[PDB]
C-alpha cells in the first residue's frame, strides 16, 4: 500500500424508489465529473469470490451456497434466508457493516469536490443522517410500476410486491433537501442536475473550511 490520509468529503445521497430514474440522474452527475458511489454495486462487490462475506457464507451454510466457479449461489441464499429468519438476521448483520465500510473505503479513495452516493433504501434503512444533503428523484407510483414491468419483464403484482416494503412517495420527499421530478425530458433533467451540481460545488467548497 501507499500512505494516504483520512479526509472527509461532502456527500450528497441520491435516493428514490425502484423505477424512479436514479441511474439516469446519477449518470448525469458522472458526466459532470462527479464521483458516484452506488450502494447496489457495493452490495455485489462485498460478496465477490474471496471476500470476507462470501467466505463467511460458505462457512455457515457449506459449499451448497457457492457455485462451481466460486461465485455466490444467489438463488439458494435467497431461498434460505426467506425460510430461516435467523439466517436473514445473520446475513443483514454481516453485510450491512461490510457495505458501509467498503462504501467509506471507496469514498476515502475518491478525489471529488463532493460525492454522489446512490442509496435506494436511504429512508427505509434510516441512513439519512449519513449524508450532508439528500436528493430525491420523484415519480408517481404508477410510473414506478410501469417502468418496472417493462424493464424487468414482470407482472404488476410482482412490481407491487417489490414496492410494498419501500417508503411511500411522501415519506421519501419528507427526507429530501432537493427534489428532481424525473418525468421531464432528458434535457430538463440534465438541466436540473446542472443546477444542483453548481449548488453542490458551492456548498462543498464553503464546507472545506471545516
UniProtKB/TrEMBL annotation:
Binding residues for ADP: 19, 21-24, 151, 182
Output the InterPro entries linked to this UniProt entry.
Answer: Depp_CoAkinase, P-loop_NTPase
Which Pfam families does the annotation name?
A: CoaE
List localization entries: Cytoplasm
MF GO annotations: ATP binding; dephospho-CoA kinase activity
Binding locations of ATP = 19-24, 151, 182
EC code: 2.7.1.24
Q: What is its main location?
A: cytoplasm
PANTHER family to which the protein is assigned, alphabetical: BIFUNCTIONAL COENZYME A SYNTHASE-RELATED, DEPHOSPHO-COA KINASE-RELATED
- UniProt-recorded name of the protein: Dephospho-CoA kinase
Q: Which gene encodes it?
A: coaE
Amino acid at each position: 500500500a501507499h500512505h494516504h490520509h483520512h479526509h472527509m468529503t461532502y456527500t450528497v445521497a441520491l435516493t428514490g424508489g425502484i423505477g424512479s430514474g436514479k441511474s439516469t440522474v446519477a449518470d448525469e452527475f458522472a458526466h459532470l465529473g462527479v464521483t458516484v458511489i452506488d450502494a447496489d454495486i457495493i452490495a455485489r462487490q462485498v460478496v465477490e469470490p474471496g471476500t470476507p462475506a462470501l467466505l463467511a457464507i460458505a462457512e455457515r451454510f457449506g459449499p451448497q451456497m457457492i457455485n462451481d466457479d466460486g461465485s455466490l449461489n444467489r438463488r439458494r441464499l435467497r431461498e434460505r434466508i426467506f425460510a430461516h429468519s435467523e439466517d436473514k438476521a445473520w446475513l443483514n448483520a454481516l453485510l450491512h457493516p461490510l457495505i458501509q465500510q467498503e462504501t467509506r473505503r471507496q469514498m476515502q479513495a475518491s478525489t471529488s469536490p463532493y460525492l454522489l452516493w446512490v442509496v435506494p433504501l436511504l429512508v427505509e434503512n434510516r441512513l439519512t443522517d449519513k449524508a450532508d444533503r439528500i436528493l430525491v428523484v420523484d415519480v408517481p407510483k404508477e410510473t414506478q410500476i410501469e417502468r418496472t414491468i417493462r424493464r424487468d419483464g414482470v407482472s404488476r403484482e410482482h412490481a407491487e410486491h417489490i414496492l410494498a416494503a419501500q417508503a411511500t412517495r411522501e415519506q421519501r420527499l419528507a427526507a429530501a433537501d432537493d427534489v428532481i421530478e424525473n418525468m421531464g425530458s432528458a434535457d430538463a433533467v440534465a438541466s436540473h442536475v446542472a443546477r444542483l451540481h453548481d449548488k453542490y460545488l458551492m456548498l462543498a467548497s464553503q464546507a472545506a473550511s471545516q
